[PDB]
Amino acid sequence: EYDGKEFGIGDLVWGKIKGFSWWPAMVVSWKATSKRQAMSGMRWVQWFGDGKFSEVSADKLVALGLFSQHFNLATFNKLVSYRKAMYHALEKARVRAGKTFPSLEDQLKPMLEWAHGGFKPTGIEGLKP
Amino acid sequence: EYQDGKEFGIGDLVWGKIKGFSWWPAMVVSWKATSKRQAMSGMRWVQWFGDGKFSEVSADKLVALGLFSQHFNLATFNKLVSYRKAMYHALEKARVRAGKTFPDSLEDQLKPMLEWAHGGFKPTGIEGLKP
Ligand SMILES: CCCN(CCC)CCCCCCO
Ligand SMILES: CCCN(CCC)CCCCCCO
């Protein structure tokens, strides 16, 4: 923990599992999961919004920093769970990036703008553990 | 729960810092107390004294309540009755845990508990605040 592959503990990522759009998450240690060690090539991630754990292939994870590419507007409008997930993921992104902003969709607005805009001034660097 | 290599576990009395508020006393709780969800790794559910609400707070924006004089905010204390009430509930919990006793308005009961806390929780020291 953690096989040659990408991503380590604390990284903010989008992860893709069956039945769900790309979904924001944080790579965690298997010890945080109360479950089991991850198989080689896999990563435990904890999903923002519901705090649940999934073992996901490192090959189906991308940096949260690739934001606009993987943000899914339709899902965002359809599912309140996705919007909450976005809030909590960007909230963590914010704090790590020493970021400051002035309701759910109210707080989300400057967060999303900051994300879609490249996480300036820190850039992606501000999202690292 | 909370096996992420960070400080603080269930029942700990802490000051927690969130946006728009002074450092505020709280108790670390299990996510099960919250009716919400598991905290993100590196974070803790805390329940704020005074209003009993739950917030998910990074363990790095938490400090032991025992570090009292450092995080007690006198301006907030003088300004907000909610903060004074929170102090009362936080310190009463600390007091019972510490095995401390003192000899009545809110501020009347608060007075020796604050002196106690501000003086370093004598004679137990901060160790007596453990759950
Ligand atoms: C509505 C939120 C649902 N999210 C989906 C995120 C992709 C939780 C999925 C839980 C999967 C556990 C085992 O793999
Ligand atoms: C006046 C009392 C204020 N309390 C505690 C302040 C730290 C309000 C906390 C809001 C909880 C929402 C979830 O995060």
Q: What is the CATH number of the domain that holds B119?
A: 1.10.720.50
Determine how β-strand A23-28 pairs with β-strand A42-47: antiparallel
The span from the CA of B74 to the CA of A34, in Å, is 41
Q: How far apart are CA A28 and CA A13, in angstroms?
A: 11
Strand pairing class (A61-63; B62-64): unpaired
Evaluate: CB of B25 within 6 angstroms of ligand 2: no
Contact yes or no for B17/B76 (Cβ under 8 A)? no
Separation CA B89–CA B83 (nearest Å): 10
Neighbours of A4 (CB within 10 A): 7
Of A43, A64, A85, the position where a domain reaches its end is: A64
Give the residue from A70, A56, A49 showing the smallest Cα distance to A6: A56
Indicate the pairing of strand B54-58 with strand B43-48: antiparallel
Show which of A38, A64, A90 is a domain's final residue.
Answer: A64
Please report, for residues A22, A72, A123, B5, B39, the alpha-carbon distance to residue B8 in angstroms, rounded to integers and kept in the order given. 32, 36, 31, 10, 13
> SS3 for B104?
coil
Residue A114 · residue A99 · CB < 8 Å: yes
Same domain as B56, residue B74: no
Provide the residue count of chain B. Answer: 131
| CB of A39 less than 8 A from some CB of B | no
Hey, is the C-beta of B20 within 8 angstroms of any chain A C-beta? no
Residues near B5 by beta carbon (within 8 Å), at least 6 away in sequence: A29
Whether residues A2 and A23 share a domain: the answer is yes
- Eight-state DSSP code of residue B128: G
Note whether B29 and B76 are same-domain residues.
Answer: no
Structural domains of chain B, count: 2
Q: Are residues B70 and B35 in the same domain?
A: no
Q: Does residue A21 sit in the same domain as residue A56?
A: yes
Number of the ligand 1 atom closest to the C-alpha atom of A17: 7
Q: What pairs with residue B55 in β-bridges?
A: B46
In chain B, what residues touch A48 (CB-CB under 8 Å)? 40
B45, B48, B16: which is closest to A51 by C-alpha?
B45
Note the resolution in Å, 1 decimal.
Answer: 2.1
Distance (angstroms) between ligand 1 centre and the Cα of A20 equals: 8
Calpha distance A44→A39 (Å, rounded)? 9
**Chain-chain contact of A52 with B39 (C-beta, under 8 angstroms):** no
Longest dimension (CA), chain A: 43
Residues B54 and B73 in one domain: no
Q: Give B48's DSSP letter.
A: E
Tell me, yes or no, whether A94 and A60 share the same domain.
no
Q: What gap in Å lies between CA B3 and CA B54, rounded to an integer?
A: 20
| Set of chain A residues whose Cβ sits within 8 Å of the Cβ of B31 | 51
- For B42-46, which contacts have Cβ atoms below 8 Å and span 24 or more sequence positions? B42/A10, B42/B4, B42/B6, B44/B2, B44/B6, B44/B8, B46/B14, B46/B16
Distance from the Cα of A50 to chain B's closest Cα (Å) equals: 6
CB A56 within 8 A of CB A42: yes
Can you give the CATH number for the domain in which A32 is found? 2.30.30.140
Q: Token pair for residue B14? A: 């802490």
**Using an 8 Å Cβ cutoff, are A86 and A75 in contact?**
no
User: B45: domain range?
Assistant: 1-65
Per-residue tokens: B37 = 């969800």
Which residues does A107 contact at the CB level (< 8 Å), separation at least 6?
Answer: A87, A101
Residue A94 sits in the same domain as residue A35: no
Tell which of B65, B80, B106 closes a domain: B65
- As a three-state string, the secondary structure of A108-125 is HHHHHHHHHCCCCCCCHH
Query: How far, in Å, is the centroid of ligand 2 from the Cα of B53?
Result: 6
Q: Are residues A82 and A124 in the same domain?
A: yes
Provide the CB-side half-sphere exposure for B24 (13 A, CA). Answer: 25
The experimental method is: X-ray
